[PDB]
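Q: What would this complex look like in 3D?
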Amino acid sequence: LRQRHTELEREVSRFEDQTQQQRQQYAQAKESLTTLNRLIPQVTLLLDET
Amino acid sequence: LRQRHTELEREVSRFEDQTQQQRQQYAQAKESLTTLNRLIPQVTLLLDET
Amino acid sequence: RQGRQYQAEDLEALQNELEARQEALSLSVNEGGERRMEMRQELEQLKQK
Amino acid sequence: RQGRQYQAEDLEALQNELEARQEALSLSVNEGGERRMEMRQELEQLKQK
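A: Here is my prediction, written as structure tokens for the whole assembly.
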């Protein structure tokens, strides 16, 4: 059962790492979508680069 | 222990019902929030009911 | 679609409450998930018993 | 911030890409978190065993 703990701790580390990286890149992408639809939700049509 | 199993099965059912209901209800809330933050994220202020 | 006439004059407060309800989604789904699986493990102890 | 120029002239299509990512965010974190949590309980069992 101690060997099982070790592999379990390895697997926990893999999921914690994977979830940390995944949530960081995906949250940065989600935050990018929020910046786009908050700062420029077709507001570029009011600007129109005139 | 069979009494415990019976009550535990009732409780499993309650958790399944609750987890389903909340995931659906909040997913429809997410779908409604995403339509608002897509179509009218402060666009109502650009309009200003002028 | 949602509501019939739903505070169209100033709706940002609803976006904030719906975000709070998405936090409630994450809390509720994780709590229900851990509690149901932990009580399922209690069921396994009971089954072995 | 993301991309270097990345079609900023008309960026509407990218929001749709980010939506697929946002859906997959929830799936990927919900499953991952549940897996580690399942093993947290199993670890406690193994610990209890």
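A: To summarize the key features: The helical segments of chain C are 12-48. The radius of gyration of chain C is 19 Å.
Q: Very helpful, thank you.
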